[PDB]
Amino acid sequence: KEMPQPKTFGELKNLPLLNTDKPVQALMKIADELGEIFKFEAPGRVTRYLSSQRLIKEACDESRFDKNLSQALKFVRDFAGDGLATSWTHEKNWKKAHNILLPSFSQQAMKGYHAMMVDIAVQLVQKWERLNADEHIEVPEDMTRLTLDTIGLCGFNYRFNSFYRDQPHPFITSMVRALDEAMNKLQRANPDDPAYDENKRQFQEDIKVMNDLVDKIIADRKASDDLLTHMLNGKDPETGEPLDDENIRYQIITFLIAGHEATSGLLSFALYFLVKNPHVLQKAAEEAARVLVDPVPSYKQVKQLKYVGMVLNEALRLWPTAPAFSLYAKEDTVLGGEYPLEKGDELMVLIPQLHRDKTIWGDDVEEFRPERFENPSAIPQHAFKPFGNGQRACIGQQFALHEATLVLGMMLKHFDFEDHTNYELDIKETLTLKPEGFVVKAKSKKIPL
Numbered sequence: 001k002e003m004p005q006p007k008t009f010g011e012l013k014n015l016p017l018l019n020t021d022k023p024v025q026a027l028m029k030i031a032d033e034l035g036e037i038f039k040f041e042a043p044g045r046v047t048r049y050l051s052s053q054r055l056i057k058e059a060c061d062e063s064r065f066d067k068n069l070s071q072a073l074k075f076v077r078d079f080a081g082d083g084l085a086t087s088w089t090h091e092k093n094w095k096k097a098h099n100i101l102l103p104s105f106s107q108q109a110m111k112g113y114h115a116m117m118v119d120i121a122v123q124l125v126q127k128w129e130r131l132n133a134d135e136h137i138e139v140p141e142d143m144t145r146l147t148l149d150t151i152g153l154c155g156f157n158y159r160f161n162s163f164y165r166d167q168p169h170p171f172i173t174s175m176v177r178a179l180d181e182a183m184n185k186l187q188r189a190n191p192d193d194p195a196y197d198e199n200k201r202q203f204q205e206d207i208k209v210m211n212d213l214v215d216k217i218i219a220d221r222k223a224s225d226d227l228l229t230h231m232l233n234g235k236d237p238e239t240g241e242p243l244d245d246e247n248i249r250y251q252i253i254t255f256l257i258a259g260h261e262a263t264s265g266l267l268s269f270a271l272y273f274l275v276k277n278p279h280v281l282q283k284a285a286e287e288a289a290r291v292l293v294d295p296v297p298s299y300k301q302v303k304q305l306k307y308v309g310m311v312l313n314e315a316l317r318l319w320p321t322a323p324a325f326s327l328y329a330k331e332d333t334v335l336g337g338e339y340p341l342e343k344g345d346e347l348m349v350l351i352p353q354l355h356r357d358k359t360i361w362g363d364d365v366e367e368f369r370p371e372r373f374e375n376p377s378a379i380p381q382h383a384f385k386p387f388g389n390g391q392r393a394c395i396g397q398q399f400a401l402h403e404a405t406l407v408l409g410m411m412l413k414h415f416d417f418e419d420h421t422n423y424e425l426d427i428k429e430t431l432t433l434k435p436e437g438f439v440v441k442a443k444s445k446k447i448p449l
């Protein structure tokens, strides 16, 4: 079979299609036009975009395909280096850090983070309780305050104190700037052109901001049993080695970025979907009131918020906040019985499209219906992949979900929410997705913390 490909622009091939602020959403539209697979060419470059569970289940076979660093991740590697998310599977430092850091996400570790998560969640609830009449909430802004502070405190015993600031923590400003530059490089025809000299300067200036904080965090610890403890002291069972200093710095950067951005997106989409679906919101609120009987939630109570977990999964179905991942063929292989691939050939999994596979989910795929997840085991293998695949899946998945469940439960216990502007969904794309400009009003239910 000869594979579909979107419209081309002479020698630029398909490249100009990605000259947009919303590339994933563009690609989703192309996926709608062309189906389960399409070829995407740029000068000197080719990838194939996959949207169907039928094809993605083969792509997820680790014997045939391994994680690739997309062009995005390759640019992120300029500051994240050989940290876990931007390492190749065959780099010694991937498997070492993987073995060393996985215990930071054990059941006992998670129970250990719970009190610190509550610290930040209480800060968020207090902020909202303290608003005056008619004042409104900037949802993604506040969710980022929460998620950054949570990873900072839980992972590193470091307090970004984001609820003490009216604008983002400097770290975030540079992170966003650096990630935007990393994206802008995709289009650039002549990267070494003096025209971009200033962009390299601001890039390195933003990386420098990020690295200064990393030094602060490591300094402060020199003067806990968290992530950082494991980075500094943990030994890999296989090699018997610990991480070296250079790799440790990369992990810190990696975890500070990965550990907050997608989770803030998730919480924001979840609240967006709730205020757009009032019956669902009522059911979630009812669970929160029924389960969260104490002034502050326990770890076990969070685990009992079944419906809230369903709501979070349905939000990840529709808008998985890290919306793509890239694979390469380990050897020559045939995809789907129809698409021959050679060793090294690249694939991109367009996760929001996978999650709209009508053969898997039914015809109603645009509807927000958390009951799809009544029994998560009912979902076929490789049909729901918001956390990636296999040994290269999200290490922090349970952390994200615990924090998100705890926080949304508390939000639903303590406040009624109003979509006072009838917000029109506008999805901004950076490393991740978020509903830009999303605002609500919260009316306190006046329940003490």
Ligand code: HEM
Pocket (backbone or CB within 6 Å): 067, 084, 085, 086, 098, 151, 254, 255, 258, 259, 260, 262, 263, 266, 320, 321, 322, 324, 325, 326, 385, 386, 387, 388, 389, 391, 392, 393, 394, 395, 396, 397, 399, 400
């Ligand atoms: C809703 C929240 C999150 C989503 C949707 C998400 C999504 C993903 C996805 C799709 C991948 C695979 C990327 C690829 O294949 O290139 C991944 C990997 C990763 N994520 Fe998450 N993530 C989330 C939260 C977190 C959190 C809270 C942490 C840290 C506490 C974290 C740390 C990482 C790391 C270190 C990797 C690379 C793991 C490895 O390859 O060894 N993520 N994430």
